[model samples]
Target chain A: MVLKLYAVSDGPPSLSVRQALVALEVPFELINVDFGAGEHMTSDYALMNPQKEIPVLDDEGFYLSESNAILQYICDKYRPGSPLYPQDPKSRAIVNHRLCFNLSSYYANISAYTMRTPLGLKKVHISLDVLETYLTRTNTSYAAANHLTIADFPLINSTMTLEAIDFDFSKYTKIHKWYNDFKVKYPDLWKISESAMKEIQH
Target chain B: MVLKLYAVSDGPPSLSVRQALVALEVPFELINVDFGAGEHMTSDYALMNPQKEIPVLDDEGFYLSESNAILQYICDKYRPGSPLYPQDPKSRAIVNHRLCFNLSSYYANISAYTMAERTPLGLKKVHISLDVLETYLTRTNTSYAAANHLTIADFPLINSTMTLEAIDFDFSKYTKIHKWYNDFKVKYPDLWKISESAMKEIQ
Candidate 1:
């Protein structure tokens, strides 16, 4: 039986899973939840995931939430041989460690910073700078060497989001180059549709 | 070679590993990292873990961070028969789901609420509410039925930290949850001691 993925197209967290699914070429159905109307909070949707979060993967009778965990589950069950999730104990642990940090630390701060500021003139530049520092350090050090491992996926999604928010990546030379290279390498895979881009702009 | 655990006493994340080691009866040396001195941010520690987070378990040459992952690694490597991690894929997946949610969503909101009110009102009420909710849900749910099983859900130091911070914990308010918490502590006495002893040792 084919898996069913419940996700919104333009949402960053949901898009992270979509990006992975596309790369793995996994066949699945996408269920778009309207975040604007607060569809996720509806009783019917809440039953699927108590947290009322998006990107819930339904594998036949089984269900799983948390985007990173879903990505790991898909990679582990479906594409075990893929470099997306290396089987070696040390490498796998490293991937898990980084992924945990990204979810708890990196993404948490990003959400907090974004929520703090109004989208207008005085946008949160400090948070973006923190992200730039992370990208600069990460790209120059580990991100460049790895052959598109699971660790890179969250960072890729995060960098893309930061850029969309008008983050100045020019200061972080290595990250800008890495982001460009990433786009070119996965051009067909990570396409943000025109409609989705417009939604993000507003 | 004894297992060496680098941790701080009051640090909640480290307590998870310390308790797990005790539960397994694995002898280990405990090294303290002063949070006040910014020891975790030092260059040496950064090389060990770029994220430079706490509770790094050094099993001879192998080192690991992230408390849940470390707990699982220890169970997988040393005590496969232990009920800590289920053998069945489905059960393990559920455990992983809860652990991931705990790490990502559950604790995220709790921490935010705590930090937001950490100063003026103190974190007591916030802590109580969080624990009560979790305790109530677990007691009423069918998921963590068998007490003997060593599922990842059993090890929840992060949530426990909130309760510990507050005074006058009213377990009666959450009956089943209160009993379960006590049962967990009783079942893992030695493990609980490591955490208790660490708190005392640090003070």
Candidate 2:
């Protein structure tokens, strides 16, 4: 039986997983949940995920939720040898550490600031600046030790969201370069704009 | 070399790992960080963990932070046979799901309600009670999945802070949860009592 992934396009959590799956070329069915109609809150869907959230992955009889956890599970189960999730204990631990930091620190701040805002423009600017500063300080040679790892996925996913919200990326060179590198590598996997590509070219 | 854990007795994150270590009977050296004195912000410590957070586990040269992640790593590395983390992919995924929920949803609400209250009375009556109801509603189960094997749900280390405020959390309302708590106390007497006493004395 094929694995079923319940998700919505452009939803940050679900989108992150989708990107990983695409990069890894993992085949699965994408079950779309219409957020506009409150489909996720329906009793049928709620049974699978009590929290009534998106990005739930159903593997035959088993079920899983929480985007990052789902990502780790998939990498560990399917692509254990891939750089997505290293087998080395320390490397894996650091990846987990960074993933937790992204959730607790980076994503937490972004959600706290942007979720309830009425003015979309101001929200975009503020969140982008916050992310830019974080990226500048922590970008190092790579998100984790070296090369791409699970730690970079959340950062990559968040950058894509910031751009979707009209956050200007030209100002932060390091972050812009990192984002460019991800797009180049996963060209077919991510949704990037012609205008954004033009901006990167210059 | 002994494993080094940077933690404080009162902090929930630190206590969770401490409880797990004790339950697994994994010996480690405990280094206490005084949150009150701003010890976490020191440059030396910051190098170890960029986030400047406590409850960091340093085993030999490998260092890791985030309480839930650290707890999972310990169980996986030292006690692979232990039911703290199941070997089955699905079971481990479910455990991770619950841990993420605890980190993202449950703890967020708990912190918002209880962390910064001014008066002891306000902290106890209003904040703690509200958070306990939220937690208990989601996590309480009546019976064990197996006779002897303990799932992650059996642990209540995350709720220790709210319990410490002298909050009037009557588990009696949730009979299943109340029974579970009693069972935990009876089954893991040393672990439960040690954590409870530490919270009461410190916080």
Candidate 3:
């Protein structure tokens, strides 16, 4: 069954899910929810996802929301042996930890940093520092062979956002090294995600 | 190496971690973070975890802050074959989804409900629909939240739902959750009782 991914024109929450689906080459229809006119708040959409959030995955009504969860589900279900999300415990743990990190540490920080920076917040926060450390500790492109997991899809965009904001990646040599490695690391996923980011931005 | 789990004594975010620790049957120092006394905010705690989040894990000084991540880390490294946190991508993915669901869906909702705030969803009016959980149960074949075997997800889900249940909300309509919850209570009496005590401790 083709998965129907409910997405919005504005939010980046669905981008990771979109990117992962594209990467895994899983079939999905992009059901764009028009948030500007408040289409998502409708009672029908509420039935699709009680939270009324974007990036809802509906496989013939077995709907799943939350981008990280959706990505993990798609990858795990469709491409089990794929290196995108590892199977073994030790390796998988790094990916799992990074996803949680993205939720609490990275995404939260990036959202705040992105919102605050254009409005006059100064100083790089510890979240980025932790990313730099994560890179150093995990070794490859940040979280281990094919060191990157489904976690990287979302974190990559925010890291890219820092580049736009002129947050000086020079001081954070390790993540600086890893962030530089991303383009070289993922040509299509990175390029597509950026284009998707550009598309969602407008 | 023994994993050091940092927890606030009053709650279930850390309780999920503690439950996982006991399930793995591993020795760990329950380094309690006295949130009431501001221990987590101190410079001393700050040196260990710069992020200053609860349920931090000091795995031989490589500290991590989130409960889900720490438990995933522990279950992976310590008990590699543990059924609680599946190693397989598919099963673990369900657990992962449920954990994320717990975050933005269950915990966030219940946290508001716990504090007596009126939620937009009327979940606190506590009509507590079976629609969401029922759909998920259907997806997983009416097994547990994620699978036939119990996973780390049940801990957090129990924590969240248990909060609602503690306040005397009925789970009868959500038969799957009701079945699952009762099974948990009967299977692990101590763990079930721990949750009940933890809830009462708060209010």
Candidate 4:
């Protein structure tokens, strides 16, 4: 069955899911929800996601929301053996932990920082510091483990979003290296993220 | 081998971990991090959790943080067969989705609603989240958050829902939520006991 991803073309939340689907070679039909025309406000959209959030995944009839969960589900169901999501419990924990961190902290602060909120400057630095520590600790080219995993997709999207806006990458040396590595390693995915960020800004 | 959980007694983030440990019957030690005395700020604690958040799980040498992540790890590693966390990808995805919902929505709004000085907007957002949860309960037609059985998703939600009670948020209008919240108290006494006691401690 083909997957239908309900999202905006350049929605920040949808970026990771889009990137992961492409990376894993999962077939998905991108169903763009037009917020300006109130497509997401429709009762039909509510049936799919009562939360009325974007980036909802429809696997045939079974709908799933939340970007991280969708990423995990897509990887688990489609590509179980892929390094994107390690099968072992302990190895999977790091990826899960990073995903949680991305949702609660990194993406939160980075979004705030992008908006140039009062605390954005301070919190974003704190988030970056913690991410720098994790990247260094994992000793992996990616965020979670030794290889490119589902966990890195979200961070890469957000990191590239920051890069698109000219956020300073000079201070965080490891993140700088990792961000560059992502571009070189996954050029097409990198372009997708880069273009998505640009599309939203325009 | 025994697991060691580092957390504070009354911390909201640690509540699910504590409840899950008891539910799974995992023999463990709770090493309390005294935040009042800057205990979590110490260099030693940093090694355990870089973010210095509470409710970090130490299964022998491997350490994990993030309450939902730790909850999933405990359930997956120790109690794979338990209903607390179904092993299948789709089933587990629902649990994960609900946990994410709790983290990003229910908990966030509940906290704002229960803050020192509550406002109309905060109250409004909290009920919206509660309304969503109620709709979820109705949609699933299940007592639990995600599936037919109790799951890790219910833990943090129970924690936040109880917080709503403490702050006098009138959620009785949400009939399904009210039923599930109160029903769990009698049906799962052991887990509810910990949750109730944790609520009191928070109060």
lDDT (CA) for every model shown?
0.64, 0.66, 0.73, 0.86
lDDT of 3 by residue, B1-203 (tens): 36677887667788888887887787888887888788988877866565676878777767666678777777777887888878675567668778887875677666677666566666643443346666677656746778887788889888878877667767677778888988888888877776877878765
Q: Write the per-residue lDDT of candidate 4 for residues B1-203, one digit (tens) a residue.
A: 37898988766778889889898988998888888999888778888888888878888878899999999888878888898898788988999999999998999988877866688888789889998999888988997898888899898998889888776668899998998899888888988787777677767
Q: For model 3, what is the C-alpha lDDT against the true structure?
A: 0.73
Worst 10 residues of 2 chain B by lDDT: B139-148
Runs of candidate 2 exceeding 4 Å displacement: A114-141, A166-174, A192-202, B117-148, B151-165
lDDT of 1 at A107: 58
Question: Candidate 3: deviation at residue A32, Å?
Answer: 3.5
Query: Model 2: per-residue lDDT, tens digit, B78-158?
Result: 887787777666666656666676677655654554455446655354344334334434543324322234655335333
- Candidate 2, DockQ score (0 to 1): 0.41
Relative to the true interface, what fraction of contacts does candidate 4 keep?
A: 0.91
Which residue ranges in model 4 land beyond 4 Å of their true spot?
none
Query: Model 1 clash pairs?
Result: B83-B150, B84-B150
lDDT by residue for model 2 over A83-151, one digit each (tens)? 878766666776777677778766665545434455654544454564454455555545665678867
lDDT, ranked from best to worst? 4, 3, 2, 1
Candidate 4 local Cα displacement, residue A107, angstroms: 0.5
TM-score of chain A of 3: 0.87
The DockQ-based CAPRI class assigned to model 3 is acceptable
Clash totals, every prediction = 2, 0, 1, 0
lDDT of 4 by residue, A1-202 (tens): 7899998877667988988999999998988889789898788999999998898999989889999999999997889899889988898899999999999989888877775765778888888999999888878878888799888988887776677677887799999999898889889888778878788567
**Maximum-DockQ candidate:** 4
Question: Residue B145: error of model 3 in Å?
Answer: 2.6
Question: Mind giving the per-residue lDDT tens digits that candidate 1 earns over A74-156?
Answer: 88778878877776655666677667766766656554553244642233344344445555544543452356766666766
